[PDB]
Design a protein around this ligand. Structure first.
Ligand SMILES: Nc1ncnc2c1ncn2[C@@H]1O[C@H](CSCC[C@H](N)C(=O)O)[C@@H](O)[C@H]1O
Ligand SMILES: Nc1ncnc2c1ncn2[C@@H]1O[C@H](CSCC[C@H](N)C(=O)O)[C@@H](O)[C@H]1O
Lengths: 448, 455
């Protein structure tokens, strides 16, 4: 990120604003509303400032810019119509290692004022670094309507129960459950809104008198083939609130960037890859500790992932679990590669596969084949397929990193299969079938 | 307002972190993605720190808190489990007017670290002042799914167009509506993240070329088996930006509640009269020509027994841009929500998705399907359940073969029924559409993997 957002406590803290026009006035209005000890240096002031000045809410210094005026500040803001004077303020501020903003110059200085969506104590800030001011405004707009006008009341109240909540529940599991039940409560939200104390207390007491569960859980979550956009809503939700996430190398970084920031992350791969057993053990141990475990697996956990293996003992262990399906590689890759898995007469049967496996059955057709881990076996596949009677002219396709910005699709025919497979590395998916034909009549993702 | 939110430029700026544990490691990761010139002072560090240090990412200062270590500091964060030590780091940071955060004491020092949605350079932050950390993740979450992944791309890219935009658009409101269309054009955003220069120019041009009010395109989107939770982020992002939504009966009521208040809807499924496919294909092509952002909402997955290809092969010349957002297909959903994995250790070597009979044009392949190591998943076979029981054990499938049926999978009224092949047609007159027929030994796994409620 090119900016780190932080929420500063400016109470009884000095801040300086240079410039006394309308721009400066808007900024000053924000700092006062944050309770800063504000001083304003300007050549001329517009009414407002004086109003504040004789209302003792700030200090005014009429006259040219004075670098020493920064010596006791936490924040500096240059808002004059004079760019030369502005960078004198910025340079002064930097020598003093004070964060500073030059409003009409967003690439300069050391910080930018984001657009604010107030719902105290709850606040949302949005910005583009000065690159897309129309993007921020549109966003603030969408956000203004998206956040309930009284959402602050609930947050405020939450902080006040914060104390009784810890004393009523031993574990994190019950408190985490408390708030979840709490921020979903409309009667409460409504109650708070109508300053109806009776309804608030009634609902509050019941929440405390509730027998919340203390045990943890393990959740299998399909991460999809790679494109973070293919994660399900429920999936995003799981990694957004998990205490520990167990991911392998088939989970794209983009997807990893969606995980809760304050969560533990265990890599279960080719550091080997922690045999199955070692992965399983980790899970139940983490859930045992009453944690919210999330086993993030590529594609869909129940279609080739040892998803079941990872669960088939948790019930004997009394540990809660659930599964969140994801887009299988075959699903995404096919779609992203302009190849539908089924069409008008082509297939009435789709196959997901993998000295091995029934070639006569696979050879047959009015089917479309999708081999999951046959890259180092691609060669013998065409030999066997052709051997057991599959048309040499039959089109085939390979997809490496399907769904990713790095997607790569090689195309050809059975005879070229083995060759092609060398034109690609892992992870790659092999699709055999008449449906590959209509790839560039439907290809939309990339030209590579 | 109690906290003023500000966005800091930390690239190559001195920031100090006191602490070397996991809490310290998260703040460092963040500070690092922000480009801070990071120094971490702690008694002991966890592996992650040595890595970073052993790769010139940051500086380590193993030992007790060194106050001089703040002398040229811009930011400080107290991440130690010792409140007295933290209290000292906080006192030292304020003594020299330095914004300091004390991880476990939100209203203790100068600033609070917000929850962050990164779409750099577009960034959103959420905070309740340490009153409701939980409400913040709830909000982080909502915003994360609402903002498409590559938004930053079009944000960075806008500047290179700002010029052409004023040239061509003289009225403020015009330029504004342009940006509105530009910022929600996810195809372009993808072409940019795809480093697909041609498509970037193709798409950029179209934007100016086409009439301002036109946003013509077609998006095939998989709705999932029913649960609005099985919808993909992208799919939701699309459904919120639709001008018109063409949808069918297998798209959940709950998913529809997510479609833009007043974007026209067009029901094309079975009505209490069936709509011909070419008419549907034609509504798509035609309405995108009228310059409307069309989204064909499909039950489950677009290219899996959904006739999704056809609705697209018709768009290759109308010159209409199109894309496909895959969805969770019925098999995947019913599998996960029934406790019947489609593959397991031995049981596992060919998952087969096949169609029953309202979809004909030839005849079925019985001994192909009868094999011994595949998991058969039948779509639309409820009406041929007996015809499949008889013709299956007929071609060798062991009658004691476990089978199951999953109706309204993933839904709150999901029904799962199971047993042995010799009961298929019987357990079928026990379900209604839509359902799937799963034949395979993996069905027995449900004894240990059932977790969803049954109806
Ligand atoms: N993103 C991807 N791109 C191409 N192939 C993939 C892939 N993800 C998985 N595969 C194929 O499947 C193998 C891993 S097994 C996991 C499959 C995943 N559960 C799914 O449902 O798709 C890889 O070796 C590769 O051959
Ligand atoms: N939620 C659901 N639960 C159980 N079966 C379902 C289902 N949704 C669809 N099906 C099965 O799929 C058939 C329609 S064919 C369309 C399938 C869709 N494209 C997909 O990807 O799943 C239905 O008749 C039924 O057999």
């Amino acid at each position: 990120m090119d900016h780190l957002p932080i929420f500063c406590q400016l109470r009884d803290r000095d801040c300086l604003i240079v410039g006394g026009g309308d721009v400066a006035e808007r900024k000053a209005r924000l700092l006062l509303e944050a309770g800063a000890r504000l001083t304003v240096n300007a050549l001329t002031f517009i009414p407002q400032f004086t109003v504040w000045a004789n209302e003792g809410m700030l200090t005014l210094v009429e006259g040219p810019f004075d670098e020493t005026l920064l010596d006791s500040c936490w924040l500096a803001i240059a808002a004059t119509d004079d760019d030369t004077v502005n960078q004198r303020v910025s340079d002064a501020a930097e020598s003093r290692r004070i964060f500073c903003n030059v409003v009409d110059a967003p690439k300069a200085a050391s910080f930018i004022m984001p657009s604010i969506i107030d719902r105290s104590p709850l606040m949302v800030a949005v910005s583009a670094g000065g690159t897309s001011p129309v993007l921020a405004r549109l966003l603030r707009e969408k956000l203004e309507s998206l956040l309930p006008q009284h959402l602050g009341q609930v947050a405020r109240y939450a902080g006040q129960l914060r104390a009784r909540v810890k004393k009523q529940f031993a574990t994190m599991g019950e408190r985490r459950r408390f708030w979840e039940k709490f921020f979903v409560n409309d009667r409460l939200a409504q109650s708070l809104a109508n300053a109806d104390e009776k309804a608030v207390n009634a609902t509050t007491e019941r929440l405390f008198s509730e027998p919340l569960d203390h045990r943890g859980e393990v959740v299998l979550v399909g991460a999809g083939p790679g494109d973070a956009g293919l994660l399900t809503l429920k999936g995003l939700q799981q990694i957004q609130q998990a205490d520990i996430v167990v991911y392998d190398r088939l989970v794209s970084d983009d997807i990893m960037n969606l995980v809760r920031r304050d969560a533990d992350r265990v890599f279960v791969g080719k550091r080997h890859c922690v045999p199955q057993e070692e992965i399983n053990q980790i899970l139940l141990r983490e859930a045992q500790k009453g944690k919210r475990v999330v086993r993030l697996k590529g594609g869909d956990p129940f279609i080739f992932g040892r998803g079941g293996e990872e669960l088939e003992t948790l019930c004997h262990a009394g540990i809660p679990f659930s599964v969140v399906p994801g887009i299988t590689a075959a699903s995404g890759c096919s779609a992203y590669s302009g190849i539908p898995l089924t069409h008008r007469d082509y297939a009435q049967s789709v196959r997901l596969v993998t000295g091995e496996l029934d070639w006569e059955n696979l050879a047959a057709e009015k089917q479309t084949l999708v081999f999951y881990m046959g890259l180092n076996q691609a060669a013998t596949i065409q030999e066997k397929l052709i051997a057991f009677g599959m048309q040499a002219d039959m089109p085939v396709a390979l997809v490496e990193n399907g769904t990713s910005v790095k997607q790569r699709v090689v195309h050809g025919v059975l005879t070229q299969l083995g060759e092609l497979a060398q034109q690609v590395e892992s992870p790659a998916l092999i699709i055999v079938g008449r449906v590959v034909a209509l790839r560039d009549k439907l290809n939309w993702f990339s030209n590579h």
